[PDB]
Structure 1
Amino acid sequence: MVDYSDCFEGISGGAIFYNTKNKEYNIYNKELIETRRSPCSTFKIVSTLIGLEKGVINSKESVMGYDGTEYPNKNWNKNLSLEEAFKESCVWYYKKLIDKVDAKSVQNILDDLKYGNCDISEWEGDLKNGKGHLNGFWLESSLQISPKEQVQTMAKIFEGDTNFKKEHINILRDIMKIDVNDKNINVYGKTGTGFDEKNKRVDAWFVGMLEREGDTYYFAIKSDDSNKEITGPKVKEIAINIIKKYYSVREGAAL
């Protein structure tokens, strides 16, 4: 176990970092990182690979066709590209993408990735929340996965141990790239924001990887705080603070 409480600042949560070279895990709050929860928008990492593998999309510029629906996030109000849909967590884009994939292919791919409970039984999600077509099995619905399982899934995909094409993984790396105002830090990730009504707690995620010199760390930061203000973007700041403090570069460090 390790203590990253200083970077959480009272926010209830946990973190796990896995290094490819030492095969060692750095775990903070062992019980929480082993608890399965809705992946929320972190599922976009996998749905992007499914869409590329099934030919629904083919590049970072791929579009799904916009029907003119007005959404709160104005970056959703257009025929946006895969890259923009990933960075803006655009649910309509990804719902239209996964509906063009047959259920058995998604099932086989989640089974092979060991993606948590691999439960896509509630395909359309929780329609009893009134959000209509802004729902799916990965949004506070049947699919659930633990932070440790997320890190194990990343490692298999990005270490080249799955059947996904290298060019498809390269598209995912490109759109996952984060700008942290330090060209020495190579961080890739995806946020997830959801509320668990059964436990009255958020599902705030930041999942990805850090390429530091010749080392690679797959990580998952997760909050379960009762404060509805705790979102994926806030858990992302915690992750970056943990990276800068405990996984900083030796060479070219700031003076």
Structure 2
Amino acid sequence: AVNIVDYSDCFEGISGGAIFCNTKNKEYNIYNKELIETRRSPCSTFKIVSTLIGLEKGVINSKESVMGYDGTDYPNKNWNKNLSLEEAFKESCVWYYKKLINKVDAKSVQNILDDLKYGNCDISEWEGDLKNGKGHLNGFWLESSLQISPKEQVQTMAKIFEGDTNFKKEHINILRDIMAIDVNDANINVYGKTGTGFDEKNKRVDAWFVGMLEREGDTYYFAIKSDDSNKEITGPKVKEIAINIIKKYYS
């Protein structure tokens, strides 16, 4: 079932959409249906799935796991260390996740994405958007071949966290741990991942916050997405919007 809602009062004039799905019923609450059905690059929200792939394949094993930092200099101080999975996820550290995924064969990734119904499941540009000049800081999930709609993101999150995929429960629990966020409200549990990209062809941001809300035995899977022309709109900004929606409409 689809219920059209209006969350514009939480978007602060930023263009976008939101979708929330409750496990109990079959209700999707949808703000901006056209946008919620449009596939876009997941950007760093793909780290939700790449973490699970790495765990399943044994590239990493726990929230402490490391990827063998080699000393390469980066502008973000927190990337210049042998950071753990938990830290790499929270920092959105591209080198860690590029190295992780490059230890996994493409057929294994293809089959996992197919089974998750992860959007277009298109990994045909493995090295990513090389025209941007960033070299190895690139991949199929970053403004490249792989695209997924906000609705598909919510459907994928629900399958993962309701225990309906092939991934091990222990691995799902690691993801829950590293996705947990502080929202200054002890009576809900919010989990998610930001994503920040720019679609150069259409001159619009791909700014995401995707995750899950737990409130008194109810669970909602959500995806908030901006497509604003304002290049200053980032994943963290959309996360603020998501929290305002949760506080106003999901309390």
Task: Report TM bin, short chain.
Answer: over 0.9
| Further displaced range: 144-153 or 120-129 | 120-129
Deviations 1:13-33 (A, max 9, x none): 000000000110000000000
How far residue 128 of structure 1 moved from its aligned partner, in angstroms, is 1.6
CA distance, structure 2, for counterparts of residue 107 and residue 162 of structure 1: 15
Deviations 1:30-51 (A, max 9, x none): 0000000000000000000000
Deviations 1:165-209 (A, max 9, x none): 000000000000001112112000000000000100000000000
Contact 2:113 2:121 (C-alpha < 8 Å) held by counterparts: yes
Aligned pair count reads: 248
Tell me which of 71, 76, 81 is aligned to 2:74. 71
CA distance, structure 2, for counterparts of residue 172 and residue 107 of structure 1: 21
CA distance, structure 1, for counterparts of residue 36 and residue 119 of structure 2: 12
Matched with 1:239 is 242
Contact 2:192 2:209 (C-alpha < 8 Å) held by counterparts: yes
Secondary structure (helix, strand or coil) at the match of 1:31 reads helix
How far residue 72 of structure 1 moved from its aligned partner, in angstroms, is 2.0
CA distance, structure 1, for counterparts of residue 60 and residue 163 of structure 2: 21
Secondary structure (helix, strand or coil) at the match of 1:116 reads coil
How far residue 210 of structure 1 moved from its aligned partner, in angstroms, is 0.1
Deviations 1:120-171 (A, max 9, x none): 0000101121111100000000000000000000000000010100000000
CA distance, structure 1, for counterparts of residue 168 and residue 134 of structure 2: 35
CA distance, structure 2, for counterparts of residue 125 and residue 188 of structure 1: 27
CA distance, structure 2, for counterparts of residue 241 and residue 51 of structure 1: 33
Contact 2:188 2:216 (C-alpha < 8 Å) held by counterparts: no
Matched with 1:105 is 108
CA distance, structure 1, for counterparts of residue 230 and residue 173 of structure 2: 36
Q: Is 1:52 paired with 2:91?
A: no
TM-score, normalisation: structure 1: 0.96
Task: Give percent identity, aligned residues only.
Answer: 98
